[PDB]
Amino acid sequence: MVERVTTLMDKPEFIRNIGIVAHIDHGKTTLSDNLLAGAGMISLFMDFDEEEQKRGITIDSANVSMVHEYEGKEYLINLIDTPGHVDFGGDVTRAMRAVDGAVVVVDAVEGAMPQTETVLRQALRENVVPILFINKVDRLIMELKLTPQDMQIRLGAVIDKINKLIKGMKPDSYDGLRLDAAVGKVAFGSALNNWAISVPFMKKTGIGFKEVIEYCMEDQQQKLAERCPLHAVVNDMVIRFLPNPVQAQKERIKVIWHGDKGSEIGKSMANVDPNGKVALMITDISTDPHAGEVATGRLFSGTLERGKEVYISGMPNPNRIQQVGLFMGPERIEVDRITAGNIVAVTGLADAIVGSTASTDKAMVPFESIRHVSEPVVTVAVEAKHMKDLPKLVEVLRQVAKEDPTLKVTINQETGEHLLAGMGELHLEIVAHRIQRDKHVEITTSKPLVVYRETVSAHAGPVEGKSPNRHNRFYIEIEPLQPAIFELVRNGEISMKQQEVERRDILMKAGMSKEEAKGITHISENNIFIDMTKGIQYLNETMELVLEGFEEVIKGGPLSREPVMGLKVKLMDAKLHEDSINRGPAQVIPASRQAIQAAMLMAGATLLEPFQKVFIHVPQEQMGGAMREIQGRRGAILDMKTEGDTTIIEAKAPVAQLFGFAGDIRSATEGRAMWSTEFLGFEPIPANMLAETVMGIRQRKGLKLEMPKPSDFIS
Numbered sequence: 001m002v003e004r005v006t007t008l009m010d011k012p013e014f015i016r017n018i019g020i021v022a023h024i025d026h027g028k029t030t031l032s033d034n035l036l037a038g039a040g041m042i043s044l045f046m047d048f049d050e051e052e053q054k055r056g057i058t059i060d061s062a063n064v065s066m067v068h069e070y071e072g073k074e075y076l077i078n079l080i081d082t083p084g085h086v087d088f089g090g091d092v093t094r095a096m097r098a099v100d101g102a103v104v105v106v107d108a109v110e111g112a113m114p115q116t117e118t119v120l121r122q123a124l125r126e127n128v129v130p131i132l133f134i135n136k137v138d139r140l141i142m143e144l145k146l147t148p149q150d151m152q153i154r155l156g157a158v159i160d161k162i163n164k165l166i167k168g169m170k171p172d173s174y175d176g177l178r179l180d181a182a183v184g185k186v187a188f189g190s191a192l193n194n195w196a197i198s199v200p201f202m203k204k205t206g207i208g209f210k211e212v213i214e215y216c217m218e219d220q221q222q223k224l225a226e227r228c229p230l231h232a233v234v235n236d237m238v239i240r241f242l243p244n245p246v247q248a249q250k251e252r253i254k255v256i257w258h259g260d261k262g263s264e265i266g267k268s269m270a271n272v273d274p275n276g277k278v279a280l281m282i283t284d285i286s287t288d289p290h291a292g293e294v295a296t297g298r299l300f301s302g303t304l305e306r307g308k309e310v311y312i313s314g315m316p317n318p319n320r321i322q323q324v325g326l327f328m329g330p331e332r333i334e335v336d337r338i339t340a341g342n343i344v345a346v347t348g349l350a351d352a353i354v355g356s357t358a359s360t361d362k363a364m365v366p367f368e369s370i371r372h373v374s375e376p377v378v379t380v381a382v383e384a385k386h387m388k389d390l391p392k393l394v395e396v397l398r399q400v401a402k403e404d405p406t407l408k409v410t411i412n413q414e415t416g417e418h419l420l421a422g423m424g425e426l427h428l429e430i431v432a433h434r435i436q437r438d439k440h441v442e443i444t445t446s447k448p449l450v451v452y453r454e455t456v457s458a459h460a461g462p463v464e465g466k467s468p469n470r471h472n473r474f475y476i477e478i479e480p481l482q483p484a485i486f487e488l489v490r491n492g493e494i495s496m497k498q499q500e501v502e503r504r505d506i507l508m509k510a511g512m513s514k515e516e517a518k519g520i521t522h523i524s525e526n527n528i529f530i531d532m533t534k535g536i537q538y539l540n541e542t543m544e545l546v547l548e549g550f551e552e553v554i555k556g557g558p559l560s561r562e563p564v565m566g567l568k569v570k571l572m573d574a575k576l577h578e579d580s581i582n583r584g585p586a587q588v589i590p591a592s593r594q595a596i597q598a599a600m601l602m603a604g605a606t607l608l609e610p611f612q613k614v615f616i617h618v619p620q621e622q623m624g625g626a627m628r629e630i631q632g633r634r635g636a637i638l639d640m641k642t643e644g645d646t647t648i649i650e651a652k653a654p655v656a657q658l659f660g661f662a663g664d665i666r667s668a669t670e671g672r673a674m675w676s677t678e679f680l681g682f683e684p685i686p687a688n689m690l691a692e693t694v695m696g697i698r699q700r701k702g703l704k705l706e707m708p709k710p711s712d713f714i715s
């Protein structure tokens, strides 16, 4: 529907910008593909990457446009199919920035799962409107053999669960967001077998759930697909209940744009005004063989045209648009111009990165950053196979990191090697593949290792740090953050920019003494610095330097130069030299670093390692094989439930223990165990493993091969 798409994209009221989101494997891509087939867009089309087809997983968000007719008018559905695996969660985040509505897909059998909540929360954070498609209802009918009422109960429990999540996330918006099957905001069906129903649709066609069960039970789901077409029921739901750009954009900018809402551009964004100045939110960078580098984004105001110039936020020179169009899976349909309200593919924006604001005016308030979180937990060292390829590798790693901001690329100064840090083993496997196959650089990679965290287990101090000229002294106590306070900081509930009586009240109503709440001076990662001193001359002008020493230590702790978390650092006393020449950065910053590092080692310094939480659905026949695999990897079982022939195992294990788990769990269960994973958190390494783990880390970093001591820091 090439000419259809183009005619429709000019009319913002008939557009739906949507994303398909779900727990891994609940059926996003089958849904998206069969929506496209039913709609006559195609005869898995969206998993068009080779590794996606090879591994049977969505790795990258894919974009496609779809024409659907509803009550005598055609609508343009700009759809994003997103990945389910936690390692690719940043693809979901970037996609939620670009869409206005979301089809939350949930497997009827497993029901809502941990990444179901994750994707729902990411949608609501962006003021994206959710509807619900309960998929795999064929399995629920054919494998559990439940009566209609049992199946009404099961489906209704899923709806209720999604609604509790919504109500917990957006309590004041709950009424308008609540999912109601009788209203039509929920459908149920089988993406695989091209059929779907909803309460209003069943009334309309005169078909009950008992007839639906018969269709499946008598091996006639093809007939059901004709009577109850998947694409009709779901696309209708999309048109009816997901919002157009005209309703939505004013809601999106409440949370993605902190500029003057009554400005010229705030109005033209709020009105989807094609004649306004360009306002284009860049959500993705990727490379194609013909278009070259391509920026994906959401156009809120203006019109994009080949040859038009836009400014990129933070960059001085104006970028020129070379081509504009829409993605159709692996293809990108080119068009003369695209108007506000659409999800666009643009070439020629050399300076754009994920999160960029493209605008006509250089002085436009930039859109809010695309939030990240989830710091890397797995790392690999990477090197060019042939030394003639070193500068290509430099340029290629820059490009890989630009296209995937969840990857962190640093350089080992003690080996000249590049380190790739990402979300998991699979994440790094794909990256190494996308450097060789796609970027044409032969590389060698080390085995994946985890990134640890350093912390303390007890209180210590006051410890005296002394400047190299011996003229300045700082007295530091250190101890663990209480869990309530750690959570406030990790969730961003407090801040030094925040108001001082407000922050003091949040901290104190969390357990912190008034002394320490009012003394809090700095936050850095999941650590705080408190000033407990009164009336020390020159400490005000010197405190900025003390905090720099604190920040440096947080970046890499004294045990193994791993990042530090969970620390409460307190300045109890200080002595500074009268003359500023004796108390500048070269004097104060080392004194601060050394006091803090010595206190840490005196406070039961130890390592935390990342843990994954693992969910396994396995038939009873293979339960024993599943159990042996997780228990053999020193994982702890957390709970176990039975639901018919299936055992549901909830377990945790160190990330470091779960490398190669996919292939081993398949072998031990003959491929019959479904499993998924999520980051749990950093937990203490075994107490009898601290010396060996620290030595292991220091050796592979090039650091000195000896256990650090507080005598290394304070003379």
Ligand SMILES: Nc1nc2c(ncn2[C@@H]2O[C@H](COP(=O)(O)OP(=O)(O)CP(=O)(O)O)[C@@H](O)[C@H]2O)c(=O)[nH]1
Residues within 6 Å of the ligand: 022, 023, 024, 025, 026, 027, 028, 029, 030, 031, 056, 057, 058, 059, 082, 083, 084, 085, 135, 136, 137, 138, 139, 189, 190, 191, 192, 193
């Ligand atoms: N029985 C049944 N199987 C389905 C249905 N929908 C999808 N599947 C199956 O589930 C598996 C995963 O399907 P897929 O569309 O790739 O799910 P996905 O959520 O996109 C996977 P990922 O999270 O990695 O992107 C496939 O074997 C697919 O055939 C359904 O309605 N019924």
Ligand SMILES: [Cl-]
Residues within 6 Å of the ligand: 480, 481, 482, 485, 486, 512, 568
């Ligand atoms: Cl605390």
Ligand SMILES: [Cl-]
Residues within 6 Å of the ligand: 536, 537, 538, 539, 540, 541
């Ligand atoms: Cl002062």
Ligand SMILES: [Mg+2]
Residues within 6 Å of the ligand: 028, 029, 030, 057, 058, 082, 083, 084
């Ligand atoms: Mg998929």
